Write an enzyme that holds these catalytic residues in place. Sequence first.
Site, mmCIF file in Angstrom:
data_model
loop_
_atom_site.group_PDB
_atom_site.id
_atom_site.type_symbol
_atom_site.label_atom_id
_atom_site.label_comp_id
_atom_site.label_asym_id
_atom_site.label_seq_id
_atom_site.Cartn_x
_atom_site.Cartn_y
_atom_site.Cartn_z
ATOM 1 N N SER B 158 18.477 -39.646 -14.706
ATOM 2 C CA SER B 158 17.925 -40.354 -13.539
ATOM 3 C C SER B 158 18.604 -41.718 -13.294
ATOM 4 O O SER B 158 19.805 -41.789 -13.018
ATOM 5 C CB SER B 158 16.403 -40.549 -13.714
ATOM 6 O OG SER B 158 15.715 -40.601 -12.463
ATOM 7 N N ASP B 259 13.780 -31.327 -6.306
ATOM 8 C CA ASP B 259 13.988 -32.748 -6.579
ATOM 9 C C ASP B 259 14.570 -33.409 -5.329
ATOM 10 O O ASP B 259 15.612 -32.970 -4.821
ATOM 11 C CB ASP B 259 14.924 -32.905 -7.786
ATOM 12 C CG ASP B 259 15.195 -34.370 -8.166
ATOM 13 O OD1 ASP B 259 14.760 -35.288 -7.428
ATOM 14 O OD2 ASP B 259 15.862 -34.602 -9.224
ATOM 15 N N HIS B 289 12.570 -32.913 -11.005
ATOM 16 C CA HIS B 289 13.123 -34.197 -11.435
ATOM 17 C C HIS B 289 12.533 -34.657 -12.778
ATOM 18 O O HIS B 289 11.342 -34.468 -13.059
ATOM 19 C CB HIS B 289 12.878 -35.276 -10.380
ATOM 20 C CG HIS B 289 13.532 -36.581 -10.708
ATOM 21 N ND1 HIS B 289 14.859 -36.842 -10.436
ATOM 22 C CD2 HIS B 289 13.051 -37.680 -11.336
ATOM 23 C CE1 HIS B 289 15.162 -38.059 -10.866
ATOM 24 N NE2 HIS B 289 14.086 -38.588 -11.410
#
Lengths: 320, 320
Positions: B158, B259, B289
């Site tokens: 991320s 996501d 995600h």
Amino acid sequence: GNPPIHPVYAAAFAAMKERPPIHTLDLKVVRESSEARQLAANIKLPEVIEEDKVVESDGKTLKLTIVRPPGTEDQILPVLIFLHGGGFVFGSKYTHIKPVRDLTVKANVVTVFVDYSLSPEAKFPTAIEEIYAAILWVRENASSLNINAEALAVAGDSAGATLSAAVSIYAKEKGLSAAIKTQVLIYPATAVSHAKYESYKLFGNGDYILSAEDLKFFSNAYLPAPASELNDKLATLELATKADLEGLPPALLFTAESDVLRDEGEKYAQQLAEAGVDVAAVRVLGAVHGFITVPVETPQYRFTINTIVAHLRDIYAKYN
Amino acid sequence: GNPPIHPVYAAAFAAMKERPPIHTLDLKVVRESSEARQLAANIKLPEVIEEDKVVESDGKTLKLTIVRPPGTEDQILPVLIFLHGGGFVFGSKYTHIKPVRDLTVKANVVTVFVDYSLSPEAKFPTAIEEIYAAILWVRENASSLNINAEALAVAGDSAGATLSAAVSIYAKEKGLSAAIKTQVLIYPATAVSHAKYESYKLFGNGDYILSAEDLKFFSNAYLPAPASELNDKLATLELATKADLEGLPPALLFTAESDVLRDEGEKYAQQLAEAGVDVAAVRVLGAVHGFITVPVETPQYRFTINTIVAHLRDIYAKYN
């Protein structure tokens, strides 16, 4: 309908755009038909110990090629059943020599290459039945092959991926549900009707390596009747029920971004997961259909070989 | 906007969605935010040798954690620079303890965990500058850490993935372009405006783990001005030119099917390949995600760990 593809794939298609459609060729385009063109490739290949055998099993006569790494003849290895692509119409041990030899030495296994009967001389479901019979033979002769027959996998590309998936269901219906420990499926074909999916429309007009026109030729060669009248999941995997798929062996599935068969491949991954099967599935960016047999190395050829090897070694380690 | 997700990820979302929202919390929600709620998971972890250090480098003071497998202390190992996610706002060595220990023991490396300055107390580009300085420090002390500093990689999830990619460009602009041999990027954020991409619409309305409302909180925390006024590629990777990206190290990029950041991550892959960078990129089916930090194992967690390990060992081997 328009992302970028790797320059190697773009260069390969441009050379192909000159040729006539497939139904207008003598099927001894098998000879040039990249036995010859693949030898001309001149690519690097790792050394191997290769052997051909002709045998009887479950009421059929089979031809097999057995491939092993050097210096392992006296060591007991896990075993990989490999089923080649070619639309059910082409393919041999010469056309697929690069991925077979790569998987064999990198995973450190014994690869049994099954030279199944090609279409249109043979039709559904002869090859599925041959591949089931070859699996039975390997289990019977493990001591003479120096393999651990319990550590067994099936893997294939395109039409070979379709066969890997169907013989996994067939073997289960015969009472052999524990034989295959994993199925590796590289861009399979699954649909009764392909035009249902958006990727058919985006990549099927003849400007990518596998066209809607090419597909119609292979279906007619392989099937003894139209798919919609045939109504058989072993022919068209998309028809499989939740019950048909329950208890199947853990799956690894690859799909190609610019490929008419993309979305139906991803739909089958979803079907397996709904039935409770362990599934790892990925879409490969920048790639086109059939890329595992393209001679000039690309970052996605290397990724896909290494990723399969790591999955096989993860599965095999549970059985040693 | 509607493919299936794994039952485990749906369960994780409902548990997180029921909890109070983010912008209504004291940032000493850090103690509970999966330092405790992680510990509390009590999952099996593999044995490791861990050490904390506080050092000076390039005009900054850094906090580092060094992790190694047991029985390798006298052996010289390659090194992995690891950058944790958490929206730039949360995260520590306790929240990311599972993938860090897995990668370390399976790849057989020394992991240097960089405990960078969190937002909103610090803002862009402080953390990027700290990570460059840690890379310099690791290079200065290879003999004391027992590593081959040439065999070096950066990897993150991320916001940690966004940092990996930006510090690869920053280091290049500093004349240190040969230091990083590969970048591993797990669902990064890249866009000036997210609503330009279809996946923002499909998965951003609050029924998935990272919502448009959540994203807006993290951007305001991290950025000292709006992205459109900032106009800086190191903040928002999407702005990078072909000239910016030339000569960067080979990439492995993962994207998640369900996501909001999916399409912009896949766009950055295209940008790197256009500039001539070696790129392998895949979309992971059934995943959401943040999945690398979910405690209960899925076929996707296992695939992703093994596949990264196989890529790192491929790269490292050409430097030994």
